[PDB]
Design a protein around this ligand. Structure first.
Ligand SMILES: [Mg+2]
Lengths: 68, 402, 18
């Protein structure tokens, strides 16, 4: 009861900062998005294709077994 | 009609790589008795047994002993493994009758459909093993009253030219096929690894050949070919230094014919280095693509990761592109970026922070994520967007009452 | 420049071994 009153009362003061709309314009002015994670993909359709990064490839172990 | 050259520059500079090696048959390596894993020992054994075979054929009783002992362990392990197959078959014929074992159907997530309307189509008998693996390939927007999967991806992997489990030429292949009465999608990739030397017979020296092709009818009516040859060696500047070089060729064959069309040629380098307390991994590339009609277009790319002993938890990476369009004397178009990450734990929660800088538009992107598996103390910040919504509700409810 | 000559420095010194 006291906590949910004091948190909202502090939010009223902290949210009421000056200007408050130029930063909306600053954030929305960069309509190019944040840069997204790179994957190897095909040129025509963009399905992922397998990678040979050393820090992942150094953990891999395979073996050979006879067939039936 | 060819892809942009930034695609090739990103593809040819993606970090320090490592090729495909030899896999060992575990019952004959370490004859009879159980083993453990180590790369140098397996790589030694594969070339050691070919050498002892050549010496045993030439004469040489000491090599004949080793090769005959390997043959004895090989026969014993093979007969044991077929006995295990017979035992598994008898156990399956006991547990079920003449019935077979059935897989789980694929989960596609929630829908406004009864979710077992088509689940009986993806429950099938196994077949157990034939060499290849299949996965179904799904599209982003499926049909409304049906399952979204449309294509099939096949995967194969082998080691053909071995003598008795001492292999030669690691090889693998992957084909995606979607065929219907309207369109046709056919992508493919193959890798072949060739090992020249391993220690103590030399240093580790491995080349790798990659081929890939792209067909997409009736949208494109041209096919895409790529070929990559790249070579790695551990050394060249000091002990255990993982260096590598490579080249790439690409073409857009017009009508499918690989003799006509625009071409792309590129080369790349990688290296690692350790100076002071700084360990760095760097790679760089240059591509010399041909345009549709304009001619030469060239680009440079580079990536670097700076590992640091002290403060072993800060990750920091740097990236660069340079563009050289025609009228090259005044159209040098640079671009470079930085990336930092760190990681804390506080208040019973695990925090991770990532700071990103793009440096053309002077923007800093900060992103923090947290995870509290203990309590809801992390929700005290949830009072921040709940106030403003009220300030956008009453201000609506005022304007809706006027 | 940088990734033509030094992209053949590595190629020549890899050919120097094999
Ligand atoms: Mg597909």
């Amino acid at each position: 009861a006291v906590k949910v009153a004091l948190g909202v009362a502090f939010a009223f003061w902290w949210t009421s900062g000056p200007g408050a709309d130029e930063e909306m314009d600053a954030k929305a002015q960069q309509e190019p998005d944040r840069r997204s994670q790179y994957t190897r993909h095909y040129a025509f359709k963009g399905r992922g294709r397998k990678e040979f990064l050393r820090s992942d490839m150094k953990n891999d172990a395979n073996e050979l077994v006879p067939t039936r | 009609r060819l892809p942009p050259m930034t695609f090739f520059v990103e593809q040819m500079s993606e970090g320090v790589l490592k090729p495909e090696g030899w896999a060992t048959m575990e019952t004959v390596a370490g004859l009879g008795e159980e083993v453990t894993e180590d790369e140098g020992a397996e790589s030694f054994n594969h070339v050691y047994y070919r050498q002892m075979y050549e010496l045993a054929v030439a004469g040489d009783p000491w090599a004949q002993r080793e090769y005959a002992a390997m043959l004895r362990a090989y026969d014993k392990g093979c007969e044991s493994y077929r006995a295990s197959y017979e035992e598994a078959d008898v156990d399956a014929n006991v547990e079920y009758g003449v019935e077979s074992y059935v897989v789980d159907p694929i989960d596609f997530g929630p829908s406004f459909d009864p979710e077992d309307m088509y689940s009986h189509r993806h429950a099938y008998a196994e077949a157990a093993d034939a060499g290849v693996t299949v996965i179904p390939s799904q599209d982003y927007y499926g049909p409304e009253h049906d399952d979204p999967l449309n294509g099939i991806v096949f995967q194969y992997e082998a080691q053909p030219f071995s003598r008795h489990g001492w292999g030669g030429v690691p090889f693998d292949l992957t084909v995606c096929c979607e065929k219907d009465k309207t369109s046709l999608c056919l992508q493919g990739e193959t890798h072949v690894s060739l090992v020249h030397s391993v220690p103590p017979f030399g240093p580790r020296h491995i080349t790798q050949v990659t081929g890939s092709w792209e067909v997409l009818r009736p949208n494109i009516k041209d096919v895409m070919y790529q070929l990559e040859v790249d070579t790695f060696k551990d050394g060249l500047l000091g002990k255990s230094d993982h260096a590598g070089c490579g080249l790439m060729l690409a073409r857009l064959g017009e009508g499918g014919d690989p003799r006509k069309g625009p071409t792309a040629v590129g080369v790349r380098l990688q290296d690692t280095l350790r100076v002071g307390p700084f360990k760095l991994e760097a790679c760089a590339s240059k591509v010399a693509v041909q345009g549709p009609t304009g001619g030469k277009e060239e680009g440079w790319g580079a990536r670097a990761f700076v590992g640091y002993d002290w403060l072993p938890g800060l990750g920091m990476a740097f990236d660069f592109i340079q563009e050289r369009t025609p009228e090259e004397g005044g159209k040098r178009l640079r671009g470079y970026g930085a990336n930092f990450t760190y990681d804390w734990e506080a208040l019973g929660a695990a925090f991770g922070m990532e700071v990103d800088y793009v440096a053309a538009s002077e923007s800093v992107f900060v992103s923090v994520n947290a995870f509290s598996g203990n309590d809801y103390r992390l929700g005290w910040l949830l009072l921040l967007p709940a106030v403003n919504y009220f300030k956008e509700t009453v201000s609506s409810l005022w304007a809706r009452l006027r | 420049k940088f990734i033509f000559w030094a992209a053949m420095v590595y190629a020549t010194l890899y050919g120097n071994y094999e």
